C-alpha cells in the first residue's frame, strides 16, 4: 500500500511499471505504515 502526494489515495500497486498515481497524474508515492508492534527503551 502506497500513499500518493498532493492527492489522497492509496495506490496499492506492486508492478514494476506502475509508478504513476491513478486519476492523479503525479509520480510521487509514499509507503504507508502498517499496524506493527515495535519496542523502545525509554
Amino acid at each position: 500500500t502506497y500513499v500518493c502526494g498532493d492527492c489522497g489515495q492509496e495506490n496499492t500497486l506492486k508492478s514494476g511499471d506502475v509508478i504513476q498515481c491513478r486519476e492523479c497524474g503525479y509520480r510521487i508515492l509514499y509507503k504507508k505504515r502498517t499496524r506493527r508492534v515495535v519496542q523502545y527503551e525509554a
Binding site: 504513476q20 497524474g25 503525479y26 509520480r27 510521487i28
Partner: protein, 52 residues
Amino acid sequence: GLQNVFQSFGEMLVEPSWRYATVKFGEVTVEKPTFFSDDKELEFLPWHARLQ
C-alpha cells in the same frame, strides 16, 4: 536580459559557394515551467523536481 542578448547577435549571409537564406529573431517570450505527463499537463513545483 534575454531581449538584449537576442537583439545583439547579427546573422550573416548563408552561401556555401541565385538563392540565399537568412534568419532573424523577434520577440522572446518565456513561459512558466510545466510538467509534461503522459495524461495531461500538471502544475510543476520545486519539491516535485527535487523528489523526481
